[PDB]
Structure 1
């Protein structure tokens, strides 16, 4: 009686409202659905988590003074190339990249992890071009 492995399953699209939800918590549930660890047929070594689309990423909310005290930094490899970016500016420019950074901070690494991050699609604002994919709305 070997442990069961499922066959390949079509990923079920899932829409998620970025508005009104906390950054960390929402990113948590997003990562959870992304892994497919909501499915009884779950298996680690294969990306069978669901495709996820989010809208109103700008409409995310964050507790405390994290608007400014949270500094998304980057590194160019160049001396003094540490580019600190506060959370506010990062909202004004790339809020979708904010959620990308937060959820990517929670995914398991490795090529499976990167493909999983490909499996996610953020859209700041209320719209997205995936109606053909039938994005199932799912409150969290």
Structure 2
């Protein structure tokens, strides 16, 4: 029978974001978000590495995107289709742009939402100085 893993300590990670393409970066963040990188993978338990990102505003994006890219927030009320361009998100809470990126690449299941928690994001940098901080590119 295939290996039956057990409790594993959360491996935190420190991730840059300057000049990093939105999609290309989110990809690695998600794959590392779940323990999919470690050969001891197990979709059942879900034990992905705690990813913490900084320098959110620094994220690059190709061609017409700051102006073209649109987001959609729909309330249950009529006409509540409220939509926002990319430039505005960077103005308000910019961390959002990357979150809605990773969130979109995370699985639809409940545990996936549990993974989205493992994902921390800001722009300064300066994370909540906890302990772990294994830098990466």
Normalising by structure 1, we get a TM-score of 0.92
CA positional deviation for 1:124: 1.6
User: CA-to-partner distance for each residue in 1:105-125, whole Å, 9 max, x for gaps?
Assistant: 000011100000011000122
- Separation of aligned partners in 2, 1:25 and 1:74: 24
- Separation of aligned partners in 2, 1:106 and 1:74: 18
User: CA-to-partner distance for each residue in 1:20-60, whole Å, 9 max, x for gaps?
Assistant: 10001100010010011110100001221100000001111
- Would you say how many aligned residue pairs link Structure 1 and Structure 2? 137
- Separation of aligned partners in 1, 2:107 and 2:57: 25
Contact 1:5 1:41 in 2 (8 A): no
Contact 1:13 1:136 in 2 (8 A): no
Structure 1 residue ranges, 4+ long, deviating more than 6 angstroms after superposition: none
- Give unpaired runs (5+ residues) of structure 2: none
CA positional deviation for 1:136: 4.2
CA positional deviation for 1:131: 3.7
Q: Structure 1 residues 130, 45: CA separation in 2 closer, same or farther (over 3 Å shift)?
A: farther
Which structure is higher in strand share? 1
Root mean square deviation of aligned Cα: 1.2
- Separation of aligned partners in 2, 1:135 and 1:30: 14
Normalising by structure 2, we get a TM-score of 0.94
Which structure is higher in helix share? 1
